[PDB]
Amino acid sequence: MGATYFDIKGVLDRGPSFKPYGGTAYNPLAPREAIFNTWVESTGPQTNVVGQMTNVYTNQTRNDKTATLQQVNSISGVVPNVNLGPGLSQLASRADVDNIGVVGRFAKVDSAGVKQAYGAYVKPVKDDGSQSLNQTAYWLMDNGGTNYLGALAVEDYTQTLSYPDTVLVTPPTAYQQVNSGTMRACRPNYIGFRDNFINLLYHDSGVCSGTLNSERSGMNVVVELQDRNTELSYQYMLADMMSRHHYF
Amino acid sequence: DQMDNVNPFNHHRNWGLKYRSQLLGNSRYCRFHIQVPQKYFAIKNLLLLPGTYTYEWVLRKDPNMILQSSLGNDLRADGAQIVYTEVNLMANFMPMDHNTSNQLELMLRNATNDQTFADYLGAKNALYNVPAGSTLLTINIPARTWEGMRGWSFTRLKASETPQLGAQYDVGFKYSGSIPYSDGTFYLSHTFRSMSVLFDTSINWPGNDRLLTPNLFEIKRPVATDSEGFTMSQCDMTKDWFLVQMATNYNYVYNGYRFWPDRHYFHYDFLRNFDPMSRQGPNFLDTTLYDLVSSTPV
């Protein structure tokens, strides 16, 4: 019986908490700062005695906000109204969708809540990174009253942001907006077994007490108790004959 | 200090668990296959002779048994799942010549030479759940015959970090960490104080003014230094107790106090795993002597 092992073989998801790496999954560099979405910083209206008939006069209950914090990137030629072309062949080579000359694509508002950068995944949709619902927007602050030609070309679109292996602490606020709950760098966990598969097979469980036994006289000759620590023995008897510090 | 008492092993840098947690995969999901043996004290070395012998054993599923975790949390709360595709019983025989064969049985089938198998641990298992504040732990054994008795090997162990063996499962265990009661990852053992042994309530073992305190082997002297006298080793151990784990151990003691070559010191050892600490006043003493002392939280 020294030559008799139970040959397992099967399936098994480790659950949802098997974190086979250390801390952060994705991005590990770039700080706990963010990507480049839609700036919407504004308190908003209130619910108090204001707009009445003749009771009390109300001033102005409006303060729209749709700015967008970001950062330019790539370089291209001119930046007209027809997007922009980072090249030139037989005509104006309109930049690709996944990337259009100067600056770059940006997270839109539709994105369920905004998070920081060091916490950001969005599954792909073309063998070369690209999604859908892409919208552009040109920029030009220096309005001297002469040239209205922009210089940037943002490609705002929604992504599939989430965070399966990232959890933060205290978000900017509680309200579900474009703030930054940004959960990040979860705690690592390696799911496996125990040296010499301790547990695995029920030992010392009268109920599930094994059963070798002959046929000719079929009397089971194996009957465990609940005092015959089995695991602990073998694991004890192993360091002994050889450093349990082995890696078979 | 605020850590002495937790299962270290159940750490993340347990290089072993960091290891065994891969011959599977970095994806919570593994279309596995493996070869698990048995270890039942009474067969591992059995060599059965000609003519079939019925056989039946059983696998378990509780994810807080057949599965370990660095952080150590039941994988049921997050239903981890195992499913045995199929299993068999491989077996490698010995192409033993036949006359020769016909011989060993001819012999192996003898009365004189009936094999036998004795278990390494060599002992019984009793479980006395202590309270959760209690300090002494009285274990009045009953009457009976103690013939053959070796002695007492003993260590404390959490409650939650140890299960009560019996039926298929136990709808209460919610832990994926370690079972020193099944790996000896003992770490809750030097938390012991005294250990009185009473035969027949009138006679004590060993008694015969053996220990500088024989009414109970001592294991340590109260926090505030009091038994600096019978301390020793430069640790709380009593010049009494050091001489036990140093007696029933390396037979070195009555005439030499050296580290019996580790060649007799692998794992469950007393010397190497033996660690002696020391530290001063982390508030530079309470509010008494040190003229301008204080406490400061977070």
Add this chain to the structure above:
Amino acid sequence: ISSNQTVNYKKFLCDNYLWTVPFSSDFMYMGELTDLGQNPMYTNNSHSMVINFELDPMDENTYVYMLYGVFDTVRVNQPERNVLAMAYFRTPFATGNAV
């Protein structure tokens, strides 16, 4: 300076191991089972026993798991092809069963 000099918090450590007194005379290992076991005052009229402890404050519920050692021996008697039986015995504590 802890008035004159620092106070001392002396502690020690131990992991991966157990504790073990040896039912014996000299404390050392001479035989598997003990000259103590062999002993007729443990051979003769039975006895009784009580071992007490004094643990260090333990946060939550905890156990002990006590290890009493005795030969949990056995034997194997192969008589005639296809046909077996496992004897059985341990002592002290030979499958203690009594109504």
Add this chain to the structure above:
Amino acid sequence: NYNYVYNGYRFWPDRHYFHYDFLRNFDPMSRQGPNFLDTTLYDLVSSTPVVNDTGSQPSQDNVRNNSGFIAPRSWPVWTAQQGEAWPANWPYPLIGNDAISSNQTVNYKKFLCDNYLWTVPFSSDFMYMGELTDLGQNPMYTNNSHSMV
């Protein structure tokens, strides 16, 4: 090798395991679908080289992605640190809350071995009993010659 086998499957003490050994130099590997499977089951799978890694290989997603903080976008260059701090799409999560090769991950099982050789033993039982073999000694290899392939 270690004449261990017909009745015991343990790591004969390395005392018989120095260099050209079979056990220690014996390395067993395992890894899942690094494209999370081909275009079949996994409903939205894909391939992405260099001139497209979503940001350098550290396309690491669910975090600052990567892009712009290391080298830039341009294919294999590995120089200045230009770029756009924009989220990536690779490496799909194969654990966490997301991840699943339809039902669960596929398995690429391989093993390893270095500093050693392979050796069959011209023998009967496979183990080592003599320098030259009971097989060599043998007259059907002693008698009329033979041939081999």
Add this chain to the structure above:
Amino acid sequence: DQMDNVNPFNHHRNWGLKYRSQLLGNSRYCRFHIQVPQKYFAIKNLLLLP
């Protein structure tokens, strides 16, 4: 070269001295206690009678 000749041992990373310098305390002050043996070539193994 300008170092061949000095007592290395008397270094800071002498892990031993880094060790033995603690079973006492990180405070220049230790209310110690210890067990020091002898080694006089001619007795260490002597076994005196009654």
Add this chain to the structure above:
Amino acid sequence: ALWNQAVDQYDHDVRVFNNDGYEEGVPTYAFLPDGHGAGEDNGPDLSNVKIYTNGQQDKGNVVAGTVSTQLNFGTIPSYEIDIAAATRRNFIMSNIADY
């Protein structure tokens, strides 16, 4: 620890200096953090402009809603630090030098 047995020994690498020098790969920089919603500091402001005008074919026009945003005509701040040697220098510069 009993017999205060603890032979005295230095750090290999230190006594007999071993100099592969060091080795570095990608110049890794630290970058302007900025809480979160930022990342870059040096950056002007630009308003959202369009072209769709009712009476103009080729020319742009400014909207009404956003007239201030944070961005930049470059990337994001950094400062190389060849750790590889830094620690090394902080290694000779502290194990033999000062010794």
Add this chain to the structure above:
Amino acid sequence: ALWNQAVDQYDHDVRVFNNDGYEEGVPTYAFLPDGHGAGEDNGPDLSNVKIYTNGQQDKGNVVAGTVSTQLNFGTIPSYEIDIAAATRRNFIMSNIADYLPDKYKFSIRGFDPVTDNIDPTTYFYMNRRVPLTNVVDLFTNIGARWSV
């Protein structure tokens, strides 16, 4: 050293890539040093003002002695650097990456005499052909033992 006995062996961690990925704790920053008496750079100036006025109850007043000081409307400059991976990236990016077969690398546009008389077995090209960054960095099968 006599018998030049010194078996050839690589670095464990390198051959068989082992990827826990890395691990970081507190974003540790470097901060504007400034000799000493400083610490922070970006900061305006403010004069020492009081209120104790001989003829005024609720209002402040400026003194005469100091009219210039260095401070700031924030804290002190910094730039995160997740060492944890940085070295890691600087580890794959230098032990296997750059140690790959020129059959999965690529020469650079702007060489001088490389390959001119050189081949892939000569330092020049040998050590002048860029690899494929994008081939083996930090997030590569991570969490799994998979020697490239």
Add this chain to the structure above:
Amino acid sequence: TALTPDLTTATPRLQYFHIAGPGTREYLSEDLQQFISATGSYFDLKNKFRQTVVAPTRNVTTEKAQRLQIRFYPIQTDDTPNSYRVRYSVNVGDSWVLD
């Protein structure tokens, strides 16, 4: 069970289960022995018959309470500024012996 026979699991017991009597060679089939050794050069069986140890239970140790250890208190101290002489006295029990 406060009920036990002044002779439960004795001799025949330590006998049957290789807990005593003769070692494996003093009891193993004479021919069994041969092969055992005659092929152990490749067929491990050097266990499947355990040769229970055992110990002497006579004239070794004492019965009357003696002293495993004694703490001696000085008799003639004598401190100084760079020395510390210490006069101890030590007796060897009649029928006592020390190393």
